[PDB]
């Protein structure tokens, strides 16, 4: 049973998932649109959107929390200097997932996830 | 008869003499009578009731006309209650939790929480075999399922793994702790079937 449980395992261990979503969150902030599998896109929202929320309030503490969760100062800088400012008036929903068919190699359901004002 | 309610959740009532009574809170909104079954037309005596408030788009035209015949708003479903020898009700009558004002004990029916596909240990309280002492791949497995050539088959009703829960369960003879007609609440002592939010059928206790 998984009654009321959140979070997808994605056939990985916890440390792999954490590392993967840190990378993928970095990729989405950097590029503003990425193509990934639909389940990964849905989970990535729960990682990326809180980073954008954190980035609305520029402070050393918040930059360091963002750095702890991204480990990339280019990404932290973009969050606090661009995205947080860009999304200051938006109450959540900083991303949109667009389904885009099936991956050739494994028939994986694919989606684009992008920042909403890209 | 009984009423249809909703499992809100569980809490406690502290009594003045320092007893904590575990209570299931049941929200019993007005049950509106949608149909009265009689012996002439239907061959048995019953009321059909509705409760709650369904949204127009989700109410089909067949459903709408049934409610419209009764002259009541669409609720979230229909439930029947068999009538006693005396009991009379009218179509469109609303029945409140005040029904239970003088009732001491109730039977509460709901749909149990769904455990999905359950092993024999969980489903039937089978004992596990040895975790060690040489056991090969047979820790929680059911063991033997029959005899030998006589009878050369497994008997019907054999306890085996399968779907557990997500089925109708009645818990009998629950004490009515409080009937709060103003808040549309019935408080019953102890647990009742189903998750928070699920439909409950509450009836006066059959046993006594």
């Amino acid at each position: 049973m998984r009654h009321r449980k959140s979070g997808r395992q994605l056939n990985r261990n916890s440390s792999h998932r954490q590392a993967m979503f840190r990378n993928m969150a970095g990729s989405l902030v950097r590029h503003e649109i990425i193509k990934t599998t639909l389940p990964k896109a849905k989970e990535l929202r729960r990682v990326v959107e809180p980073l954008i929320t954190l980035a609305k309030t520029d402070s050393v503490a918040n930059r360091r929390l963002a750095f702890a969760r991204t480990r990339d100062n280019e990404i932290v800088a973009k969050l606090f200097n661009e995205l947080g400012p860009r999304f200051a008036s938006r109450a959540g929903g900083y991303t949109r997932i667009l389904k885009c068919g099936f991956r050739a190699g494994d028939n994986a359901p694919m989606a684009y996830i992008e920042l909403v004002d890209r | 008869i009984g009423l249809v309610g909703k499992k809100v959740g569980m809490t406690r009532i502290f009594t003045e003499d320092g007893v904590s009574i575990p209570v299931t809170v049941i929200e019993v909104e007005a049950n509106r009578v949608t149909q009265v079954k009689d012996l002439a037309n239907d061959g048995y005596r019953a009321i059909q009731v509705t409760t709650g408030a369904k949204k127009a788009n989700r109410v089909t035209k067949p459903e709408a006309g049934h409610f419209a015949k009764a002259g009541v708003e669409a609720g979230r479903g229909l439930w029947e209650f068999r009538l006693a020898e005396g009991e009379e009700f009218t179509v469109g009558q609303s029945i409140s939790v005040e029904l239970f004002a003088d009732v001491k004990k109730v039977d509460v029916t709901g749909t149990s929480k769904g455990k999905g596909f359950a092993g024999t240990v969980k489903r039937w309280n089978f004992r596990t075999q040895d975790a060690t002492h040489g056991n090969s791949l047979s820790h929680r497995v059911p063991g033997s399922i029959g005899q030998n050539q006589t009878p050369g088959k497994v008997f019907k009703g054999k306890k085996m793994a399968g779907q557990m829960g997500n089925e109708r369960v009645t818990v009998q003879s629950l004490d009515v702790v409080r009937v709060d007609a103003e808040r549309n609440l019935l408080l019953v002592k102890g647990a009742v079937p189903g998750a928070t939010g699920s439909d409950l059928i509450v009836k006066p206790a059959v046993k006594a």
Binding site: - | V8, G9, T11, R12, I13, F14, T15, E16, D17, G18, S20, V25, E27, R183, L185, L187
Partner: protein, 114 residues
């Protein structure tokens, strides 16, 4: 939810004092030995608090007549007549289960004087 909130809030005591893990508290409990009722004091260290509205509880550890005793009080129970902080303890943790393995000098808690 909002329903259960309302049912719970009307039963909640309004006069529960502030206390923290590590405090020495005296809890006076109603004891009915027959029909006569009286207050029995239970004094000891708060080793755990469960903050959970009406379902709040706290665990008090005492050494009584040789023996370590713990009592888990249901904070809003009418059995609990009164609670009073006798001494404020300075501890880091929310839960002082480590005190179960300590006696005497090892089980001392520094006073929190502020």
């Amino acid at each position: 939810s909002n329903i259960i909130k309302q049912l719970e809030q009307e039963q909640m005591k309004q006069d529960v004092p502030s206390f923290r893990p590590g405090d020495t508290v005296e809890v006076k409990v109603w004891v009915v030995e027959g029909s006569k009722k009286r207050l029995q004091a239970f004094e000891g260290v708060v080793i755990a608090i469960r903050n959970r509205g009406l379902h709040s509880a706290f665990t008090v550890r005492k050494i009584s007549n040789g023996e370590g005793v713990e009592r888990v009080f249901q904070t809003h129970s009418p059995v609990v007549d009164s609670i009073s902080v006798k001494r404020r303890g300075a501890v880091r943790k929310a839960k002082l289960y480590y005190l179960r393995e300590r006696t005497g000098k090892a089980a001392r808690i520094k006073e929190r004087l502020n």
